[PDB]
Design a protein around this ligand. Structure first.
Ligand SMILES: Nc1ncnc2c1ncn2[C@@H]1O[C@H](COP(=O)(O)OP(=O)(O)OP(=O)(O)O)[C@@H](O)[C@H]1O
Ligand SMILES: Nc1ncnc2c1ncn2[C@@H]1O[C@H](COP(=O)(O)OP(=O)(O)OP(=O)(O)O)[C@@H](O)[C@H]1O
Ligand SMILES: [Ca+2]
Ligand SMILES: [Ca+2]
Ligand SMILES: [Ca+2]
Ligand SMILES: [Ca+2]
Lengths: 176, 176
């Protein structure tokens, strides 16, 4: 069991490309991920009602199966997270479909990951949604994370809007 | 999707060690596997009633998740089989437990695998059950497999008893 604690910002201004130039100076680039996500649902235990999730992710060809627990926070996306890498995405999907899970929706993004003193800054560009930033802390308190995010946006003059809604949620509303 | 077609024999005589000496001459040894299996059940879809199975296997440290479909044969264990390798057994078990599956029973064995012209001969020693042999064919018909098994037992003077019951079943009955 690992506890995911992150803050998600919708970027109002400037673009991620401009933000990338402002942080390039003192933020060490890690890698870029092309992530295709398939979310599943248990027909008897709707994860939207229990606030859970089961996700099969393809990130640069690496296949990862992820369960996420209920949100334990209102100011950050605090959740239980358990992940394993699997050998074959198709056969993992088949097993899940054979076990009775149904594919709910798909999410796709390009994520650029930067690091800074136990903080993981992710520049997210979502297909048909827009540009977001996620900051995740390694063994950091909710106050430490909230405080750093405030410093990050001020230092780089970012106009933003916080949200604990997930990309999958944002994608649903945007459809209507 | 792959179709597992195998025949399972309970060895009456001689011991596997003696059989190993008789087949050593013209059967090429592959490897020896120490397999620890955890079987799961869906509380709403008892696999014993649907004739399915979900199994998390540790074979020489390699972790494999396996779904098996219903038996499509009465003279051989003909079943649908879908497998994927996962990175961590504990976390795969946790994910399954978090998704609602319950650990049904555990099975442990030492399996010696031999090969002979598209046939996989497995010498099985089961904890608290006994000695068995399984013969599995790669793209072989039910008649081809049945016929080869008859030749195998005759050539090596094996006293046996065929069965399509699974090790997990045999283990349950043996308890009473
Ligand atoms: N129908 C649904 N089934 C399951 N989970 C859902 C569903 N709708 C929304 N969710 C939510 O999807 C969320 C995805 O979280 P998030 O938006 O952070 O994804 P992500 O940023 O791509 O993930 P990560 O940050 O781990 O890379 C979960 O946090 C979960 O509640
Ligand atoms: N409670 C149960 N839940 C799920 N499956 C069960 C259960 N009881 C019995 N089974 C059966 O367990 C069987 C195991 O098959 P088998 O005995 O060939 O195992 P194995 O020889 O160890 O497997 P493999 O041959 O793939 O290595 C399945 O074939 C399945 O029906
Ligand atoms: Ca995250
Ligand atoms: Ca996230
Ligand atoms: Ca087999
Ligand atoms: Ca078998």
């Amino acid at each position: 069991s690992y506890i995911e604690r992150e803050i998600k910002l919708r970027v109002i201004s400037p673009s991620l490309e401009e933000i990338e130039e402002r942080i390039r100076n003192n933020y060490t680039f890690i890698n870029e991920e092309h992530q295709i996500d398939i979310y599943y649902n248990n027909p008897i235990r709707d994860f939207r009602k229990s606030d859970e999730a089961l996700r099969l992710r393809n990130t640069n060809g690496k296949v990862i199966l992820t369960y996420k627990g209920p949100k334990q926070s209102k100011e950050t996306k605090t959740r239980e997270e358990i992940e394993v890498e699997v050998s074959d995405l198709h056969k993992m999907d088949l097993i899940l479909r054979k076990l009775g899970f149904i594919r709910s929706f798909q999410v796709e993004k390009i994520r650029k990951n930067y690091k800074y003193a136990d903080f993981i800054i992710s520049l997210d560009s979502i297909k048909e949604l827009g540009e977001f930033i996620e900051i995740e802390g390694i063994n950091k308190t909710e106050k430490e994370l909230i405080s750093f995010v405030d410093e990050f946006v001020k230092k780089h003059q970012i106009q933003y809007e916080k949200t604990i809604k997930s990309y999958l949620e944002l994608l649903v509303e945007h459809a209507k």
